[PDB]
Amino acid sequence: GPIRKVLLLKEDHEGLGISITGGKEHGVPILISEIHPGQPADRCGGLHVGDAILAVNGVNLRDTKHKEAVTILSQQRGEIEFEVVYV
Amino acid sequence: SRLPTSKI
Ligand SMILES: *C(=O)c1ccc(CCN)cc1
């Protein structure tokens, strides 16, 4: 599908509310495999299971390894802009 | 289960 920009709002006491799978070492993008109910990704409305995360706050996630992506995503705070694509 | 999954 089309490349989408999606805004997520979160406070520092909570996580993003997503589970991710994949990574370059698996030949798979960083994929959202779970949206957890009532947590920031669910609340923002624009992120879906099966979305590939290409970037977050302008930080590239293309061709990142799984744990590289975990560190990058978990560092983001406040108003977070996701660049995602559903394939 | 071949792929890793992380909750974030
Ligand atoms: C993770 O964000 C998450 C997992 C499970 C639940 C259900 C709580 N009973 C909420 C959020």
DSSP state of A10: -
Q: How far is A1 from chain B (nearest CA, A)?
A: 23
A25: helix, coil or strand?
Answer: helix
Give the resolution in Å. 1.5
Which residue type, as a one-letter code, is found at position A35?
I
Q: Which of A36, A44, A47, A74 to mutate to test the pocket of ligand 1 (most atoms within 8 A of CB)?
A: A36
Which tokens hold the place of A30? 């960083």
Nearest to A64 by CA among A31, A21, A24: A24
DSSP secondary structure string, A46-87? ---TTEEEEEETTEE-TT--HHHHHHHHHH--SEEEEEEEE-
Which tokens hold the place of A22? 């994949």
A30: helix, coil or strand?
Answer: strand
Q: How far apart are CA B8 and CA B6, in angstroms?
A: 6
Domains with residue ranges and CATH for chain A: 3-86 (2.30.42.10)
Q: How far apart are CA A36 and CA B1, in angstroms?
A: 19
Residues 6 or more apart whose Cβ sits within 8 Å of residue A70: A20, B6, B8
Q: How far apart are CA A28 and CA A46, in angstroms?
A: 21
Q: Give the determination technique.
A: X-ray
A34: helix, coil or strand?
Answer: strand
Q: Are A20 and A69 in contact (CB under 8 A)?
A: yes
A36 phi/psi in degrees, rounded to 5: -85, 135
